[PDB]
């Protein structure tokens, strides 16, 4: 008893009735009245299993269901069989209800809510369930859904649990006046508007008791943004919450008060109590009157913020406006009283604000902030004065990391809001032929035969065999012709489509052969290999040409700079569309609109109608939203056209939304939703967030990265996702795994916090610019290079190195490639060294990723050198158009200098690839991660600033011939080069330094030689030098305590070098007196006073006999680095140098009694006396004793064992072969003669007394001779 095959609608979720009476289609949901005279209606059946179907009506009549006017409507189709009351009818017949009396109030639905509120705004209203706001038609330019003044007077939700208004796109109440909204929640807000915007309402004129309002979602505005209310006048918000993005990156130049919770607090009794705002707010001030305050912002007229909490992130581009973490411009425009300004109390803000303060932007004497709190986070300030510099703000109260302990400021957290309408699938049993074991198989074949009878389904399911792979759960398949993902069926149905890719729930792809076997004009059919299973496309092959010939000409006449596009987007005529970066792809999609539009009409919905009503409905839907459709088509094609092998997902993402499941969505609906979503949603910078909002939750995927991983699992299996990333992208990706076997094995894995792959780092969380993946997938040419090494991720452009010497093609590419490879190798060697040195298990934290952008200063071929043309945006350079621009990271980009913002490093002048790029690389890296990486784990010393640990301490030397005490961690220079002359540095890093003990031994031997030479020079000073010569030859260094702006205490000491008096000069007759009187050589150290946080490095050959022990908190800079290197010579890096500069002995000071008020909190003060008494408890009591004992040890050493193989020429251009110093006595005699020669007839003009001075020549010659004697500094005895 084989059954017949007909078309059948199974999972009929709901049914709708549309009309064409007035030439415009509308929803005749209820009150059809008398049966209509003419039948131009068409029934739209929406299914939970597959997409909707439009079928023309046949007969509309009235039938008494139970003595009521319930209209029965029967639709006309080819062979449509409907299973009604367990029996089959040859036509789809359904009943329509009369009406539902729910419009008397606003309980049920939002569509009824906007109607009910407008009737009488005053009163009391309660929500009945979680209601979706997608039912309202938004409006062309409507400000808010509810337009009355005072609305929602008592709109509470205490009737049942808590109900949330899902999917908001405009302000809810527009205005509020003496109206109390309480217990209301907003879950997915996407508000975008030109004027002032507010999630709850735009203004609160009178006493609006806002309570228990938790709003979540992204808010984008231009003229002004607000978290809950754009302006609160005499209104109080208590126990409210916000948790969404806030963007105001537009180039507006007006007075806006953007705030994460409320825009403007102007009321006398206005108050914010027990409120929290997790606002990852980004904004561009561009003018001083602007204010970005997170919580509130520009608080005025005694409005008091009590018990608030700000945990978001503020990313201000420039510090022009008054931006702060928890309170913006507390000052008022009128008289500046302490009380009239505003009040803060018991407030906390652990917000990573940039370019601004952590608490209040404008700080004055009569401060009314009272009690404030802030944690240890980034508060960087780009002063952009001359060379770009970044410093901390220091204008907040500082606390520890125990934020959860101090989280009792706001006890209220959040509430569990009820979910929206589920509308499940509600999934046949007891058919003609049924088997229990093959149940799932039936479902597995239902995706293969849509619009078919259940009898045919089970008949074909019985034909499935166990050997085949149809026994796993199967998602929707994709028909393809030789890896093409064909969509336009009516064009490619006659041609036998080659393959059908079944995508199973195991993320497995299985290819079956297809042939146009059984041919129906109504619905195409196909056969699947030898199994005999039938496959049919989910489209009725209607006349697409009738729709195309109509809709194509109107869509063709559109311009990117037209007013229609600007009106469809949320753009004011002032701001430009350059941030979209879709003009080229706009034109491209404009030319070939035919193919894409045919694919869209093919994948949209199944038209089983020969009557022109359904095709007219499609035409109207495509025409009414032409601008939005075209913008969506441009955006989806621009950023989603990357190939998995030979399969391009431009057709599988834009169309075929059922590949992951969820066939209920329509590819046309998502395009319209993406087009009209706004300017910020279509923005290129938010490509990762746009997917989650528009594309996701509709294609069946959670996020963009999960979608990419899913497509990599389906297409191109058994290959790592990072490998596919490296293969597909057109950026030159260079990865260098460290030489150490342990870290080399650790990096190979795909694990987070350890993988070196570019995709594993970019797509990971806690990455600032994770939106850099989608543009990088779409690079047309080798325009950008990605240097991804351990603990780094540098992005650079090829146009940065293009100049007169390097032509635009062939030469620039090769040069950039080779130099990038060498720079990756150098960075890898540097981090290999730093991994070998650090042995305190802090090396496991050397895997953090921080980007390394370049200058953006692209240079044309006409430019002689590296051009300084900033090229802000919209440049003709392909690197700026296809990258950097889309990954919009507005930088300062000055002419000279490099700065490390704390989360990344930027090269404004030094080119990253050049060999001078690494010497600045190590300095910027020391600036970036000195707090928790290079040090043992404790922060910087309180007095020492960021420039102290970098310029003279942990950095590679600027040049090889530089006579400075530094560690050559990066640059590798072979002996073959001409740089062998005056080496004075380490030959090969990562070979000399294999452990911390190796570094300690190297520094110990270097300072042994340095101490020998310095002792010889000192004995030359006291014994053979006159008084007048002694005065000029030496200087006296002291420590002067000056007031600093950041901290109140003046315990910090600054070094000062001064000309010593003749009275003190005469006393200098003993070498011990040189150490006691604190004297240093004037050959290389200037006579002016030094400053704190300065680029001061101690010279290698310029002696510093002074042991200027600063009994206070901080030694200084010139003396600090010298004593730190001496301590490193005495004890190891972790044992000696780290406790000196990393205040690890701070707590002990707090236990002793040494204290300091740091940022308003009592903290320990690590004095030099404590460091001396803890590092060397029994050996020494004073730093002078330590210096003297080091000198005495070196003396006892060189008095016995010194290598006679010392070869120093110290002669002019005529080559001098060998002086063969055999004992220290001849060397001391030569030093005496050199000092006497330098004293006699001193030039002291044109500066630079380091080359002409004969004393420096002898020291350099001896140093180079001893360095070249052994392989490296191993032992000098």
Numbering used by the authors: 674 to 1100, 1109 to 1958
What's written in the study?
All classes of bacterial IgA1Ps cleave host IgA1 within the heavy-chain (HC) hinge region, the linker connecting the IgA1 constant fragment (Fc) to its antigen binding region (Fab), leaving the light chain (LC) intact while separating the Fc and Fab. The overall structure reveals that S. pneumoniae IgA1P is a multi-domain enzyme, broadly comprised of N-terminal (NTD; residues 665–1070), middle (MD; 1071–1611), and C-terminal domains (CTD; 1612–1963). We have determined the structure of a member of the M26 metalloprotease IgA1P subfamily of bacterial IgA1Ps both in isolation as well as in complex with its human IgA1 substrate and solved its structure with a neutralizing mAb that provides insight into blocking S. pneumoniae IgA1P activity.
Thus, we focused our cryo-EM studies on a construct of IgA1P spainning residues 665–1963 that could be excised from its MBP tag and had comparable cleavage to the full-length IgA1P. Despite the unique structural folds of the IgA1P MD and CTD, the S. pneumoniae IgA1P active site comprises catalytically important residues within similar positions to that of the prototypical metalloprotease, thermolysin, which supports a conserved catalytic mechanism that is consistent with our previous biochemical studies. Specifically, three side chains from IgA1P H1604, H1608, and the downstream E1628 coordinate the Zn atom and are homologous with thermolysin residues H142, H146, and E166, respectively. The Zn both polarizes the carbonyl group of the scissile peptide bond and activates the nucleophilic water molecule that is deprotonated by a fourth residue, E1605 (E143 in thermolysin). Thus, it is the NTD that repositions from a “closed” state in the absence of substrate to an “open” state allowing for binding of the IgA1 hinge region.
